[PDB]
Amino acid sequence: ATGDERFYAEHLMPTLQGLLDPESAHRLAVRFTSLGLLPRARFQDSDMLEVRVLGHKFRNPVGIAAGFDKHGEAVDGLYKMGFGFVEIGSVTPKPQEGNPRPRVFRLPEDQAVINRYGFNSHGLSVVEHRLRARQQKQAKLTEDGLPLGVNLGKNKTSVDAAEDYAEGVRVLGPLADYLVVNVSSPNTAGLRSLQGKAELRRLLTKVLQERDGLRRVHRPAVLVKIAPDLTSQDKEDIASVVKELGIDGLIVTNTTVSRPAGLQGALRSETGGLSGKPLRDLSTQTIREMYALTQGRVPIIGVGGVSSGQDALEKIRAGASLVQLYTALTFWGPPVVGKVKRELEALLKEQGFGGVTDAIGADHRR
Ligand SMILES: Cc1cc2nc3c(=O)[nH]c(=O)nc-3n(C[C@H](O)[C@H](O)[C@H](O)COP(=O)(O)O)c2cc1C
Ligand SMILES: Cc1cc(NC(=O)c2c(O)nn3ccccc23)c(C(C)C)cc1Oc1ccccc1
Ligand SMILES: O=C(O)c1cc(=O)[nH]c(=O)[nH]1
């Protein structure tokens, strides 16, 4: 536990959060990150944290989840924070404002957040030019083990979701190491309902056709991001279509529209997706189920409620090859990234694993 770690968690972050509502704080965090105004990330990544998956090398398995850098403004500052990979978005085809404010809420007693941003997005064209301005720098980062993902959304007024996602593949696919199709945002009408098995097969067939049409060095992996709120039938159907079509991986999970018993925050009954600690074990159980339904042959990125090495390793043993976090960054600040990495390496050694790779799916072999 470095000095920075306790100072940020016990003094600095609680003070700033006391002065700034969550949306204003989010905006200032993006600005400061984009300018490089961050503490020293001292942790050096060891060989045991390296993972090779989705056609790329990841120097460590801890990424920043979608929704923090929605518009691609802070990618290099996020690598400087120590993340092994960065995912931007969600990005919609046209710019759109999102839902009226207030639309973000903190539940500090639960280590949780509720949000109904509604896909506020600068749009594909603005994000395209931002990534083009650093495209070759990113190629060098990716070669050195720091890949980039892009998360694709749809506009609120769209009549055909599949054409929204196709446009995103055509415009940002050539700039991404992997693309994400959300079947799971809680704050757009009809989005998650993209589950009708034949409809989902139609959607993903069109996405993969568009992807396969891109030139070889600009052809990304394609992943599906799902909610934790699916029925057992929904999960069976998703696993089936994913294997049938050759989808490259899954992200598990988005926020939940459930409200687990025991939440204490005054704002627990606000509409929106809940993230952070109340989501942690629901997300881990969804990883465990999707890994089994796909026979361990489809890489999973595990996400929901991760703030320690134990949280990360539980998801890896359940089936994740990589993990992401977001809500913990908002309460701990930048030092949380090195904390998770240091604790994960210690636990791997304690449990007798040679590295991250040896622990993926290990609970299923017991
Ligand atoms: C404020 C906020 C905005 C988010 N926006 C997006 C988004 O645009 N697209 C997406 O796929 N997930 C979005 N997410 C979900 C996260 O990517 C992640 O799946 C979820 O928050 C669980 O991780 P966590 O508990 O570590 O925060 C958002 C989450 C939060 C808290
Ligand atoms: C990494 C980070 C995050 C945040 N905060 C948020 O992002 C945030 C929040 O506070 N609530 N929230 C709800 C939904 C979504 C986001 C949020 C803040 C604010 C408290 C200013 C600062 C941050 O970086 C620092 C901290 C110290 C020194 C240098 C950089
Ligand atoms: O409201 C959004 O933009 C949003 C919130 C969230 O939790 N997940 C997502 O995919 N989008």
Author numbering: 30 to 395
Give sentences from the paper.
Human dihydroorotate dehydrogenase (hDHODH, EC 1.3.99.11) plays a key role in the de novo pyrimidine biosynthesis. Being located in the inner mitochondrial membrane, it catalyzes the oxidation of dihydroorotate to orotate by involving the cofactor flavin mononucleotide (FMN). This latter is then regenerated by transferring electrons to ubiquinone (coenzyme Q), which is then released in the inner mitochondrial membrane, relating the hDHODH activity to the mitochondrial electron transport chain (ETC). hDHODH inhibitors bind in a tunnel-like pocket, called “lipophilic patch”, which is used by ubiquinone to reach FMN during the enzymatic reaction.
With the aim of experimentally confirming the reliability of the molecular modeling protocol herein applied, as well as the interpretations of the SAR data based on the results of the computational studies, we determined the X-ray structure of hDHODH in complex with compound 4, the most potent derivative of the series. The binding mode observed for compound 4 in its crystallographic complex with the enzyme was perfectly superimposable on that predicted by our computational investigation since all different structural moieties of the inhibitor were found to essentially assume the same position and orientation within the hDHODH binding site in both the model and the X-ray structure. Moreover, the ligand forms two different H-bonds with the positively charged guanidine moiety of R136 through both the geminal oxygen and nitrogen of its 2-hydroxypyrazolo[1,5-a]pyridine group that are maintained during almost the whole MD simulation, thus actually establishing a salt bridge interaction with R136. In particular, the 2-hydroxypyrazolo[1,5-a]pyridine moiety, which is negatively charged under physiological conditions, is predicted to present a similar charge density on the oxygen and the geminal nitrogen, thus allowing the ligand to form a charge-assisted H-bond with the side chain of Q47, through its 2-hydroxypyrazolo[1,5-a]pyridine oxygen. Ring A of the ligand is sandwiched between M43 and A59, while its isopropyl substituent is placed in a hydrophobic pocket mainly delimited by M43, L46, L50, A55, and L58, thus forming lipophilic interactions with these residues. Finally, the methyl group connected to ring A makes hydrophobic contacts with F98, L359, and P364, whereas the terminal phenoxyl substituent interacts with Y38 and F62 through aromatic interactions and also makes contact with L68 and P364.
